[PDB]
Amino acid sequence: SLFELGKMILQETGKNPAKSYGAYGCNCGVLGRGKPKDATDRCCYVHKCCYKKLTGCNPKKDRYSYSWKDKTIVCGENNPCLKELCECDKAVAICLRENLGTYNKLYRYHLKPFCKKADDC
Amino acid sequence: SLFELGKMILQETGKNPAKSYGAYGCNCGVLGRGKPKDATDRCCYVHKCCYKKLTGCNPKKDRYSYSWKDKTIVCGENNPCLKELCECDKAVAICLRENLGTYNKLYRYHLKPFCKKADDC
Ligand SMILES: *CC(=O)c1ccc(Br)cc1
């Protein structure tokens, strides 16, 4: 669930999840994928693509268990789907953290029209 | 879908859908419901409850058609679910507008933890 995601992002990035990635670029958004505007956006594209390859759980409403160990997001799941799902969020939270350096606030609330149709996952 | 919804909110509120309601309170967000922080937030709350009532379509992904006749959102869909959904979105856009007077920007990007568990719809 985006609950975990929100928590992860907040734990990694330390940034307000929605304020910074609730609507960023063409992929860090509620609706759809767009060809990435920058590294931060690519994270969400990858993440959204990560969700796509999922089968067996709802990437939005399926809560999974993970924990903060040695300041590391540790997925506490064996269910292949949740495990992966959790790994999707972790990878995105991390990625997002790793790309704060190039995070551009201009890409916030970036209108979907300025987005090109993203490649296929 | 969020597309129509957004559009409606724009049409009614005149405010940028994502900026003002993509993350406001405990309900105007991608998460679930939480005790509403104010009127605006209560709108979305109602609206999410509204979605729960839907069976036959996905409120998030499923797009639909509605007209904007005489500055009024006219749900054109004939399909029950989509019609219902549209009406749900119409109601929130309307409600949001009606409560624009007490819209408090300090609720934007409100953290979910800091959200009272919402009573079941
Ligand atoms: C999957 C992903 O990266 C993402 C980012 C932001 C929002 Br809002 C939803 C999903």
Ligand SMILES: *CC(=O)c1ccc(Br)cc1
């Ligand atoms: C149902 C509703 O009001 C709502 C508001 C904002 C977002 Br993002 C999703 C849903």
